[PDB]
Design a protein around this nucleic acid. Structure first.
Ligand SMILES: [Mg+2]
Ligand SMILES: [Zn+2]
Lengths: 112, 91, 251, 50, 77, 63
RNA sequence: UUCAAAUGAGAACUUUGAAGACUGAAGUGGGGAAAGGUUCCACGUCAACAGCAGUUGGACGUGGGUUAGUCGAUCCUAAGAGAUGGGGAAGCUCCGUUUCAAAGGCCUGAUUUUAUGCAGGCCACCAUCGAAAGGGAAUCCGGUUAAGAUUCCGGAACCUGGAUAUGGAUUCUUCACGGUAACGUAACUGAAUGUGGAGACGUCGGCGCGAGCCCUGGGAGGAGUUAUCUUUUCUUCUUAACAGCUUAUCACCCCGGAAUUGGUUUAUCCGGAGAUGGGGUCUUAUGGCUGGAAGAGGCCAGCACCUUUGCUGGCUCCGGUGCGCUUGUGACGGCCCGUGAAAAUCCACAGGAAGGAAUAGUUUUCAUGCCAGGUCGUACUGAUAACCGCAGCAGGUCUCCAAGGUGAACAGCCUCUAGUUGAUAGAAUAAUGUAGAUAAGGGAAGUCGGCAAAAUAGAUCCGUAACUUCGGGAUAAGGAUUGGCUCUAAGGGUCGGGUACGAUCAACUUAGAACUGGUACGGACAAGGGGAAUCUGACUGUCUAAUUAAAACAUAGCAUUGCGAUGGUCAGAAAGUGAUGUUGACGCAAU
RNA sequence: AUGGUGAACUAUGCCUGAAUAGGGUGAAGCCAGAGGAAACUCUGGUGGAGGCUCGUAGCGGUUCUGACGUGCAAAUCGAUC
C-alpha cells in the first residue's frame, strides 16, 4: 500500500507526464516515467497502416537500420501492397489505351 | 416489446421543448442517422460523418451531400437540368 | 451615456473571428493561362468539414503547368462531388458538375456555384450551403452575363467570370431547430461571439437608446434613418416597410 | 521558487550577505554615531519585492 | 548486458584489444530436485557492453578458466 | 470469520442489503455470463460434430 | 490528556519512556506548480517575539549546505507581441508583418601564384519574441549526508555531434539474395527534384487485455497470545533502465468457391468487390524466459568487543482467484448546424546525376573500436506557522499517489502505514447565554406566516390517481417484510469417447423452508414528509463579490429590418488603416 | 482639466492544459416469441440515449432573518440547502 510521487517537477497529469508503478529490486514501488506511444506509418493513398515497418517515435527512425523502415517492393515503405498493385494495373491499361486512342483517331482523320 | 408509441428517436428529449418542435427534429434525425445506399460499391453502407459529408464504410468513398439526407431533392433536379442542357450543346 | 454594444464591435478586440480550426481560404483556382484557352484536369483528394460553416470543402489537386509541382486547391464542395472524381478547369471544359467554367461559355439556365463577380477574384457569391447561381441572358457584344443571386438579385458581371457548375453541398442545414440554448453555444463557439443577446430594451439608458423607463419599451420609433450616426443606429435600419410580410417580394 | 532565473538568485545572494548585525569595532571608532544596523531585514517581517 | 552462446566467440572476444577486465562468478543453481549443480558465469568488460557467457557444466567451466589469456585481469568471486 | 460465514448464506437477508439488486450485481453482467456460456456450448457442439451448421445457426439466434 | 525520569535557578508546556487518544489514504501522510528566500542543518543561546510559560522555536548569535550530455530551461509554434520597406503624424509616436523592397544561401566544381576570385546550376519562402501543464534526442538500480542527489559514489546504459580502422557485406551478370504471395534478413551505391508518413490530437458508454495494489493456499524464518481454545494472529520471501529470443487483437496473402445462407459481438455487422474453412505474413502495446542480477536489497542465526568496530553462515521458493480498486492499452458503439492546434524535427518512397570492379575495387542506414557534450536552476515550506490576507489570522490558493471492515458507495463510523497529541491553565457547577437534547394530556389554539423543530427516509415484494406535449406525473398516494442459526434449490470453467455421463477446480448471487428471541432486527451510522389547489416564469442556465437568486436577465422557437463587396454594420487623429473576413444571403449586421 | 499606471481581484473573447463516486430511470438500433380473415397488434430480452434524475468531490450561497457582530474574519462560522 505504498504511495508514489512524480520524479519530475511537473505535478500535473499532462500527456507527456505519464507514469506507471513498478517494483524495484529495493522492494519499493517507484513511479517510472514512460514515453508516449508511437503510431504506425500509413499508406500514401489508402491510409491504412502498412506492414513490415517498425512502429517508433519519429526521431527514433534515424538510429534504426534500413530493413526496418521499408519493404522490398516498388514504393515499398510508402505505399500498400495492393495500392502498389493498383497503380501497376492502372498504369499499364491506359498507357495501352492511349496508343489505342492514338491509332483510332488517326484512322478517322485519314479516312477524310 | 414496443418501448415507445410515437416519440421514437426523440425519446431522449423527455418532456422538453414542445411536441411539435420534437417532431421536426425526429424527421431530420431519422434521415441524418439512417444508412444510405452506396452508388459506387452497391452496398447499404453510406453514413453521415458531418453535415454534407457522407462516407461509405465499404469502398471508403465520400460524397458531398445535404445536411441530413445524402441527396437533396433540389440538388437532384439540378443534376438533371445540367444533363439536358449538356446533351444539347454537343447534340 | 456609454458607447453601445454595436459600437464596441468595430474595435475588434474580443469580437474577432475564431480561426484556429478553419481549413484555409477556400478560393477558386487562379486564372493564369491554362483556363483562358484550354483546360486542365484535376483530382479530388478529400472532402472535409469546415469549422465555422456548414458546407463541406474539397481538396482539389492539379499539376503545376510550369514546374514539377503538385499545387493543391481549396474549393467549396458541390453536392455530388466525391473523392476520386476528376475535375476539369478551363474554357472548353464540359458542362458537368464539378467543372470550373466561365459564365459567358455556359448555356442559359445553368446551375453554377462559387461564382466570381470580377474575373480573377478566385471566389465570390453563392458560397453557402445549398446556394447556386443561374444564368438569365448573355449580352455577347460588350460581353456581359445576366444572372440571379441567391438573395433573388439580378446582377450583371463580366462574361469571363468563373464558377463551379452545380450547387453547394449541405443544403437545408437550417431546417432543424436547435431546440436548446447550448446548441447555439456550439454553433457560435466556432463562428464568433455574437451570442447570446441581451435585449436593448432590458437595459439602462446609459447603455442603450432603448434602455430605461418604468416599463420595458422602446419609447420612440425603432425605425432608424440612414443618416443616423454610430450610437443612434439600433433597431430596424433603413426599413422601407415593417410589420408582417403580407404579399409577394414585389421586386 | 525552486526553478529561478539568475537575476533572482543573484539578488538574493546580495540580500543574504547584508543580513547580519553591525560589526563590533565600528562603534569603537573616533566620532562614531552609528549605534546599530538600521537596514537589517528578516524574511518574516518585511518582503524584498524582487 | 548481452549473452553469447558459443565458446568460440568468447575466446575471440577476450583478445579484442579493448578488453581490460573480466570476472568469474559462481552461482549455486537448481536444475532438478534430485541434485544441485554449480553454475558459473564468465563476464568480459567491453567498452560498450558486458558479455556474459553462462556455463553450466563444471568440467567444461574449468577448461575455460585457464583458456583465458594471461594479460587479462580476471576477477573471481 | 464473517467472510467464511457469508459463504454458507448467512448475513444476506433483506435487512442486510443497502444497495439495489442492480447495484449489488449488475443485470448486464448477469446476461453476459448467460450469453457467453450458451455460445461456448453451441460452438463446442459443432466442433464435436454433434450438430450441423443449420441447427447451430437457429439456436444462436434463439439464444 | 496523564504518570515518571533527565536537564535547569526555575518544567502544565523542552527531551526520553510509558499510558490514553486523534487525523483515518478527495489524511493532521508523501511530492510539486505559483509565491517566499535560507525559513533547510549544526552549534551556542533566551534581553525582545511565540497575546500563559519557556531550558524550547520558522526567534537571537555564529557558521555549513543546492554537484546533470540524459530532469528542466535552452529549440518550435499557438492565441498574440513585434522590428524592417514604407505610409501618416507638428510631434512624443500610430498603422502595418509580406505588404507598390534590386530583401536572401546551400551543394558541387577550377587553381592547388591562393584566397576563394572564377566554372555552373538550385532556391523564393522570408526578422525576431512568445508555453518550466502544448510539441520535444538520450539514465536506471543500489548505496551514501547534520543538511544534496534520476546530479555524488559503485555498477550497468543510452543519445547527439565529430573524427576514424578492422571484421563483415557486395562486384567480371559492376552496385544482394530468398518467398507464388502478404513479406524477410546484419548490411546490401543513389546527387538535384518531387511525393507520402510520423510529429498530429474530442468526449462519453459498455467490452477484451496488461500493470500495481487488494484477497488467499503450501513452505522456510521472526515476533504476539496462550486460566481455556486457536496446525493460530501479525510480519519477510523483491528484481530497475537497457539487450537478445519469443509473444498480438487488428490488418493482409495463397488455396478454394458459398442458399438448406453462413460466420459472429455484451452491444448486428460482414461475405460472388470472394463468405465459412485450411494454411501463412505483419505491428511488439503488452506478456514470458534469459543477460543486467544477487555480487544488490530483505529476513534470520552464531561468535568477539572501551574499540575506528566487525566477521561467518543460511533462506530469500512454489502457487490460486476476481463484475474488486486505481491506471495504461485495444477493438467498437453513441453524439454533434460542435467533427475536436501549429511548427521544429525524423524517416521513407519516386528519379537516375555521378562514381565505380580484377591482382583488384566499393559500402560508416551491419558490428566493433576513439573523443566531447557548454550556460543557468537544483536546499526548504507549500500552508489552522515558511505563500497572500497589517499577524504564527477558523479566510483564500492549481495539481499527483490513496490500505482493511461495514456498506451501492475515493458516503458516514472503526482500524493499519505515516504523522500529531497543537489552540493559557487550575477550582467550583449561581443566574443569563451558545451548542446539543428529552418531556405527561392536547396537537398550530402560537405567529404576519408552522419560522424553528418533528415526522418520512435504505433495500425487497405489492399497489399506484387526476392530468399530459404520451416522453411523464411516479419513489405519486398507500401496505407488508427486514436479526441470528440449521438447511434446501438453482446459477460455471477445464479435462475424459470405434473413422447420456464422469472427474477436478472456483465465484458470490438469488429464491425457499424449519428453528430460535421480553415482536426484536436499514437495531449505531446512513436516510424523500405527503396531498388538493391558485398566481407567475415554459424548461436546464445566469446576476446585484459584502443586505435583493426573483415574476429579473438568458434561452430555444417566432417575427421583423438593412446589405451583392465602388456593399451592410462598426472602428480610426490619420494612413498605401482596420473587425465581421480564412466570410458571401442556408451569410453578416440590427431589433 | 492635463499627463500617466493598472485585467495579480473581477468581466468577456481567444490559446494551451487539467478535474468531475456510487445509484435511479431506461431512448434509438438489434434478437427471439405469441395472437392473428390477411393487414397488423402484443410480450419478453438486448442495448445504454438524455443541456434527465437521487446524491459525493467540486462549483454555489436558500433559510435559521442561528453564531459572531470593539469577530477567527473590513463578509467568516454551523446547520439547512
Ligand atoms: Mg379468411
Ligand atoms: Zn461504398
Amino acid at each position: 500500500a505504498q504511495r508514489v510521487t512524480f520524479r519530475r517537477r511537473n505535478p500535473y497529469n499532462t500527456r507527456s507526464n505519464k507514469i506507471k508503478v513498478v517494483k524495484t529490486p529495493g522492494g519499493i514501488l517507484r513511479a517510472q516515467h514512460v514515453k508516449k506511444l508511437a503510431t504506425r506509418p500509413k499508406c500514401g493513398d489508402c491510409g491504412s497502416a502498412l506492414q513490415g515497418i517498425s512502429t517508433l517515435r519519429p526521431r527514433q527512425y534515424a538510429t534504426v537500420s534500413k530493413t526496418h523502415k521499408t519493404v522490398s517492393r516498388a514504393y515499398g515503405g510508402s505505399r500498400c501492397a495492393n495500392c502498389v498493385k493498383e497503380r501497376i494495373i492502372r498504369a499499364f491499361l491506359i498507357e495501352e489505351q492511349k496508343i489505342v486512342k492514338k491509332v483510332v483517331k488517326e484512322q478517322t482523320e485519314a479516312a477524310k | 416489446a414496443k418501448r415507445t408509441k410515437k416519440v421514437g428517436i426523440t425519446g431522449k428529449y423527455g418532456v422538453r421543448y414542445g411536441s411539435s418542435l420534437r417532431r421536426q427534429v425526429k424527421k431530420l434525425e431519422i434521415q441524418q442517422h439512417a444508412r444510405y445506399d452506396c452508388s459506387f460499391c452497391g452496398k447499404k453502407t453510406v453514413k453521415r460523418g458531418a453535415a454534407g459529408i457522407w462516407t461509405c464504410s465499404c469502398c471508403k468513398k465520400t460524397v458531398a451531400g445535404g445536411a441530413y439526407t445524402v441527396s437533396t431533392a433540389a440538388a437532384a433536379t439540378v443534376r438533371s437540368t445540367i444533363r439536358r442542357l449538356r446533351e444539347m450543346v454537343e447534340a | 451615456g456609454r458607447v453601445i454594444r454595436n459600437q464596441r464591435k468595430g474595435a475588434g478586440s474580443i469580437f474577432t473571428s475564431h480561426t484556429r480550426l478553419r481549413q484555409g481560404a477556400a478560393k477558386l483556382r487562379t486564372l493564369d493561362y491554362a483556363e483562358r484557352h484550354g483546360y486542365i484536369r484535376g483530382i479530388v483528394k478529400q472532402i472535409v468539414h469546415d469549422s465555422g460553416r456548414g458546407a463541406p470543402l474539397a481538396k482539389v489537386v492539379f499539376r503545376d503547368p510550369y514546374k514539377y509541382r503538385l499545387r493543391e486547391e481549396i474549393f467549396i464542395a458541390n453536392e455530388g462531388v466525391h473523392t476520386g472524381q476528376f475535375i476539369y478547369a478551363g474554357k472548353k471544359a464540359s458542362l458537368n458538375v464539378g467543372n470550373v467554367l466561365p459564365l459567358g461559355s455556359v448555356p442559359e439556365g445553368t446551375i453554377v456555384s462559387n461564382v466570381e463577380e470580377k474575373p480573377g477574384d478566385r471566389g465570390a457569391l453563392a458560397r453557402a450551403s445549398g446556394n447556386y447561381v443561374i444564368i438569365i441572358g448573355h449580352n455577347p457584344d460588350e460581353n456581359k452575363t445576366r444572372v440571379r443571386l441567391p438573395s433573388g438579385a439580378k446582377k450583371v458581371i463580366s462574361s469571363d467570370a468563373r464558377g463551379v457548375i452545380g450547387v453547394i453541398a449541405g443544403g437545408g442545414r437550417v431546417d432543424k431547430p436547435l431546440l436548446k440554448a447550448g446548441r447555439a453555444f456550439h454553433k457560435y463557439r466556432l463562428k464568433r461571439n455574437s451570442w447570446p443577446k441581451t435585449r436593448g430594451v432590458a437595459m439602462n439608458p446609459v447603455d442603450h437608446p432603448h434602455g430605461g423607463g418604468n416599463h420595458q419599451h422602446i419609447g420612440k420609433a425603432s425605425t432608424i434613418s440612414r443618416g443616423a450616426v454610430s450610437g443612434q443606429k439600433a433597431g430596424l435600419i433603413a426599413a422601407r416597410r415593417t410589420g408582417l410580410l403580407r404579399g409577394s417580394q414585389k421586386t | 521558487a525552486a526553478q529561478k532565473s539568475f537575476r533572482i538568485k543573484q539578488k538574493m545572494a546580495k540580500a543574504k550577505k547584508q543580513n547580519r548585525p553591525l560589526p563590533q569595532w565600528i562603534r569603537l571608532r573616533t566620532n562614531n554615531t552609528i549605534r546599530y544596523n538600521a537596514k537589517r531585514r528578516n524574511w518574516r517581517r518585511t518582503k524584498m519585492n524582487i | 548486458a548481452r549473452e553469447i552462446t558459443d565458446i568460440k566467440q568468447f575466446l575471440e572476444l577476450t583478445r579484442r584489444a579493448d578488453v581490460k577486465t573480466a570476472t568469474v562468478k559462481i552461482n549455486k543453481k537448481l536444475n532438478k530436485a534430485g541434485k544441485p549443480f554449480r553454475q558459473t558465469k564468465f563476464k568480459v568488460r567491453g567498452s560498450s557492453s558486458l558479455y556474459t557467457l553462462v556455463i553450466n557444466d563444471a568440467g567444461k567451466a574449468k577448461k575455460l578458466i585457464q583458456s583465458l589469456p594471461p594479460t587479462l585481469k580476471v576477477n573471481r568471486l | 470469520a464473517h467472510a467464511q460465514s457469508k459463504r454458507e448464506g448467512r448475513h444476506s437477508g433483506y435487512g442486510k442489503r443497502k444497495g439495489t439488486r442492480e447495484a449489488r450485481l449488475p443485470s448486464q453482467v448477469v446476461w453476459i455470463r448467460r450469453l457467453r456460456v450458451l455460445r461456448r456450448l453451441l460452438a463446442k457442439y459443432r466442433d464435436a460434430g454433434k450438430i450441423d451448421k443449420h441447427l447451430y445457426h437457429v439456436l444462436y439466434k434463439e439464444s
